[PDB]
Write a structure and sequence with these properties.
Chain C: One of its GO terms (molecular function) is structural constituent of ribosome. The structure is cut from a larger assembly and holds 7 protein chains of 7 kinds. By secondary structure, chain C is largely without helices or strands. Chain C has 1 helix and no strands. Chain F is built from 2 helices and 7 strands, in the order ββαββββαβ. Classes of the chains: A alpha/beta, B mainly beta, C little secondary structure, D mainly beta, E alpha+beta, F alpha+beta, G alpha+beta. Chain G binds 3 RNA strands through strand 2, strand 3 and strand 4.
Chain lengths: 94, 77, 70, 47, 118, 137, 173
RNA sequence: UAUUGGAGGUAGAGCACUGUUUGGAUUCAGACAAACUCCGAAUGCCAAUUAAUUU
RNA sequence: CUGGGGCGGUCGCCUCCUAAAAGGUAACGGAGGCGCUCAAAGGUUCCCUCAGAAUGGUUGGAAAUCAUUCAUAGAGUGUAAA
RNA sequence: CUGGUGACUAUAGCAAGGAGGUCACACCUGUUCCCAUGCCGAACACAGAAGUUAAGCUCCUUAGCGUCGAUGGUAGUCGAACUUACGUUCCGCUAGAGUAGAACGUUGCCAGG
């Protein structure tokens, strides 16, 4: 339950969302009650391990920016033909 | 040969005037079958569902209920 | 009730033997056999019956021995 | 199913043209319509 | 068995009549409403939706004991005069959702002789 | 041998083959499946070759799911004829598989028998395929 | 009689069901006399006679029902009047119950009456008939075809059991 | 061309309706459609300007 | 007229799809209708509201008519479709 | 506050649960009169005021069912540039579904309290 992320700026062009998925990065959003919406970019190889035996529905202390809000994977978005995660929703729990 | 060569020389239905445009007293605003659009203020319905203005003014398309709509004509000075 | 449509009726003569409950009516029309003044039970047909007295709900081996002696 | 002519009964003759089914109305039809020579509603018999 | 409400059955018989409702501020509509001992007139202009003159059967001036049809004729006479003071002379009468019979021919024949045109 | 028992129109246009599959992209009834990484028409006579082939190999282990149904008919003109005097008569029933779709399902056997039963299947098919397990995480 | 219906409320109904209001008590609302088919191919004189029965068992010209379904494979279609019905509501609807509960008792040839489980979950008997018990003024000399009526006594009850307690007065269940 | 308002059901997508379908116990999951639609673009189109540019 | 000509099929009118959310848009492309009917099946003023499913009931054609309840729209709209 | 009457894309609705009563609204009592039921004073109309808050009606909590609904990301596309591939790349516009969530109505005029 230890996954640190980065905040991505506003109005991401179509190419530069395709440039970071070429790396081990995946877009993601953070919503819920306790904090408003944030466009966040977490890493691929660190997300799978943190979710490896934390469970499909477990608590992840996601350090967004300088805070650390305990969240839960609301839904994922997958590419079955390439075997990749393309986007993740993080639901902030109170 | 076949059985399938037929069709009718069909009809130039649809909107004949535009929203916000000025129209005279007997202008045809919309040519339909049934009522996709319904008469509002100062417009009447013909015998084959034709919508026509009844006064000189400007055309307005607006919502009527859940999923209905009407036309109108106003009398801008 | 309209005028002329409905059939002709009257307080029927329900003075039968079963307590003579003549509080009914009907198109039954005949000679007024018994016309009492307590309750209208004069004309139509009814002076007795076994209806309200004994209702259907509220109303071999032996042969052998009998024939011989056993 | 035929064609019929409605002729005025006093103003004299033909004003209107109609149709009829001669199995359902075998007689001569009767209708009050506007005679424009009398300027007045009258009765019209089928010719 | 189930009972039918007599209000909803006439509130739907009325929306279908007020598709030619026109209180236009020069020829408003004269409303009516019956409860059981209660005739309620009213006059409204539909272009703006404001009441111009109201007279009911429970007012102190019309508090009497009558047949409710000899009393309804005193409810059309009341509002017919208050409409006279408002400079209104021609109205269009909507019967609510009720049959025009008994109570209402009295409320209309009483208002149609007091000068109101309709 | 598969086909719909009814149809309202048997002369239809032909399906569009560009794009990606919309439905049937994951395994949801068995443990293993056969994915398609190429576009083509599966013709309902080559779905029976591939069912019999992978069925015979397993020898009554689990069961299979045919996740594709041949729904669209296609026509053909009578051999040597000139061009254009109407449309030809129905000649077969096809489905349309785009890259992504799962074609078959197995369960109740091992991965070492599943990888081999679905390998005989894909040699009866005109698409390039691939083996997959149930997605998680 | 009818006034006994007023005493029947506090008789057992006011105490059995324990209703907190006099207005929450059962009551008989109406009764129907739906006769039957009278096959409209050769029965133009059947319903002309059967209509005389219900008109005789109750004083009201019953309305003749017209079949509204185009049932093929049968002599029926939209039109073709093939039924008769008569409604009784007021005090007359109380007479036609006492005249049945007091005349159809022994003239039924049935121990348990007509049925014990007739409550349709909505308070309606819908019993049978043999054309002899009812129509006591209709003797066995006038007509020949003996038919079975259908008296559906719709009541203001709210449960199957209440129709049993309410219909206890002059009933054999 | 910029702004603003409109009419119109296409691509996609969805099974709420008409048809077509796989597997379990009228439901719980999965699919299909030119002549299916609870939805629904990008563009084109008809007009307004008390806006720029050019003919 | 015509994937040469010919046979077969086609010629005037109406509805749908093809038709690429205005309108229009071809082929011997895919599907169906018309050449009438109604003296009320037109005008008007009042009132009314469905098919179907359970239930319980002499008929039962499982399926007539009768009653209660859930029915939003699955009925009806003379005649093809929209 | 209650009532009459309009305006609002159901955020307004279904559903279950619970309170309420002579200034009201209703059931309710009757058929002589106006009028009435293709049979029935059920409905409609009228004449009435014994009985009741049970029902309708109104009021109050509930998010089960419907309705409403972002952001982020995707499909699909206008234009451009590469290409002949069931295509790639760049830029703009951007769904549907699905989530977090909103929500058991706002509002005008009149008459009473």
């Amino acid at each position: 339950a230890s996954l640190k992320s980065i905040i991505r700026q506003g109005k991401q062009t179509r190419s530069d969302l395709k440039q970071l998925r070429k790396s081990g990065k995946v877009p993601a959003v953070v919503y819920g009650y306790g904090t408003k919406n944030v466009s966040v970019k977490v890493d691929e190889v660190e997300f799978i391990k943190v979710i490896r035996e934390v469970g499909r529905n477990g608590v992840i202390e996601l350090g967004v920016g300088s805070k650390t809000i305990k969240v839960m994977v609301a839904d994922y978005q997958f590419d079955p033909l390439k075997n990749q995660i393309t986007h993740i929703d993080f639901l902030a729990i109170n | 040969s076949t059985k399938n060569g037929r069709d009718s020389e069909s009809k130039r239905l649809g909107a004949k005037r535009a929203d916000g445009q000025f129209v005279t007293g007997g202008s045809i605003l919309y040519r339909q079958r049934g009522t996709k659009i319904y008469p509002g203020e100062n417009v009447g319905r013909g015998g084959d569902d034709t919508l026509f203005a009844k006064i000189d003014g400007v055309v307005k398309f607006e919502r009527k209920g859940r999923d209905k709509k009407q036309v109108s004509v106003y009398a801008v000075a | 009730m309209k005028q002329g449509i409905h059939p002709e009726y009257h307080q029927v003569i329900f003075l039968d033997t079963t307590t003579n409950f003549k509080f009914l009516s009907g198109s039954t029309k005949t000679s007024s056999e018994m016309m009492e003044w307590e309750d209208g039970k004069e004309y139509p047909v009814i002076r007795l019956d076994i209806s309200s007295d004994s209702h259907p709900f509220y109303t071999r081996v032996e042969r052998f021995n009998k024939k011989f002696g056993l | 199913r035929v064609n019929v002519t409605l002729a005025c009964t006093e103003c004299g003759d033909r004003n209107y043209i109609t149709t009829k089914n001669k199995r359902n109305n075998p007689e001569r039809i009767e209708m009050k319509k506007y005679c424009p020579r009398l300027n007045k509603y009258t009765l019209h018999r089928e010719t | 068995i189930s009972k039918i409400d007599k209000n909803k059955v006439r509130l739907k018989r009325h929306a279908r009549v007020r598709t030619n409702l026109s209180g236009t501020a020069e020829k408003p509509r004269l409303n009516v409403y019956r409860s059981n001992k209660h005739i309620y007139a009213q006059i409204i202009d539909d272009n703006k939706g404001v009441t111009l003159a109201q007279a009911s059967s429970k007012d102190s001036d019309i508090a009497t004991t009558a047949t409710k049809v000899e009393l309804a004729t005193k409810v059309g006479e009341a509002i017919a005069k208050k409409a006279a003071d408002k400079g209104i002379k021609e109205i269009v009468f909507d019967r609510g959702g009720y049959l025009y019979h008994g109570r209402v021919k009295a409320l209309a024949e009483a208002a149609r002789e007091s000068g109101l045109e309709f | 041998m598969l086909l719909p028992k009814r149809v309202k129109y048997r002369r239809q246009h032909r399906p569009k083959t560009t794009g990606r599959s919309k439905g049937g992209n994951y395994v949801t009834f068995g443990e293993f499946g056969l994915q398609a990484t190429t576009t083509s028409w599966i013709t309902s006579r080559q779905i029976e070759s591939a069912r019999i082939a992978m069925t015979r190999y397993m020898k009554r282990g689990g069961k299979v799911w045919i996740k594709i149904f041949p729904h669209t008919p296609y026509t053909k003109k009578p051999l040597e004829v000139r061009m254009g005097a109407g449309k030809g008569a129905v000649e077969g029933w096809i489905a349309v598989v785009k890259p992504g779709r799962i074609l078959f399902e197995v369960a109740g056997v091992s991965e070492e028998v599943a990888r081999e039963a679905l390998r005989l299947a894909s040699h009866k098919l005109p698409v390039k395929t691939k083996f997959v397990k149930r997605e998680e995480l | 009689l009818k006034e006994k219906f007023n005493t029947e409320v506090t008789e057992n109904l006011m105490k059995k069901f324990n209703y907190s209001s006099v207005m929450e008590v059962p009551k008989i609302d109406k009764i129907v006399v739906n006769m039957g088919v009278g096959d409209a191919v050769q029965n133009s004189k059947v319903l002309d006679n059967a209509v005389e029965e219900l008109e005789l068992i109750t004083g009201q010209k019953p309305l003749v029902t017209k079949a509204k379904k185009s049932i093929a494979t049968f002599r029926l279609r939209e039109g073709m009047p093939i039924g008769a019905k008569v409604t009784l509501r007021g005090e007359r609807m109380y007479e036609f119950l006492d005249k049945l509960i007091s005349v159809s008792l022994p003239r039924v040839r049935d121990f348990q009456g007509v049925s014990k489980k007739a409550f349709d979950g909505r308070g309606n008997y819908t019993l049978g008939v043999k054309e002899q018990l009812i129509f006591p003024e209709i003797d066995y000399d006038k007509v020949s075809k003996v038919r079975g009526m259908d008296i559906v006594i719709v009541t203001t009850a709210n449960t199957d059991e209440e129709a049993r307690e309410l219909l206890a007065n002059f009933g054999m269940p």
